[PDB]
């Protein structure tokens, strides 16, 4: 599914991702345009050979298992492909375990990389609150 950007925002409060963390809202819903141009389905392959899955694009190596991964952990005792599911909740959940790891939202390269310092409320200007 790719989500309607005020979709999205709407579903990620309702799981109570709205200032966690001190992270307000528009970060999370500006981590999933970048990521993945909103759309649960989405897969791409890292060097390291990892692959990140899902609409925030959460990482095999230490986060769910795809079974490919030399070494995983399966932090979030997942299967991958649950996490391209229509239903956010799985990659919600796993979401709140990897930003409460200590470097926050930087484990998002998107975020760092395009979020970060900017007016992330653009990112939800227009969502009915
Ligand atoms: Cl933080
Ligand atoms: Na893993």
Known sequence: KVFGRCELAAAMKRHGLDNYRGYSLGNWVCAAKFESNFNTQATNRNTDGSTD???????????????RTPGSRNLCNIPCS?????????????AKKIVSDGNGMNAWVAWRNRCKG??????????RL
């Open 53 to 67: 899955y899902g609409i925030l694009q959460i990482n095999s190596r230490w986060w769910c298992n795809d079974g």
């Open 82 to 94: 649950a996490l391209l599911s229509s239903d956010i909740t799985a990659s919600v959940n796993c």
């Open 118 to 127: 900017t007016d992330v409320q653009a990112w939800i200007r227009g969502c």
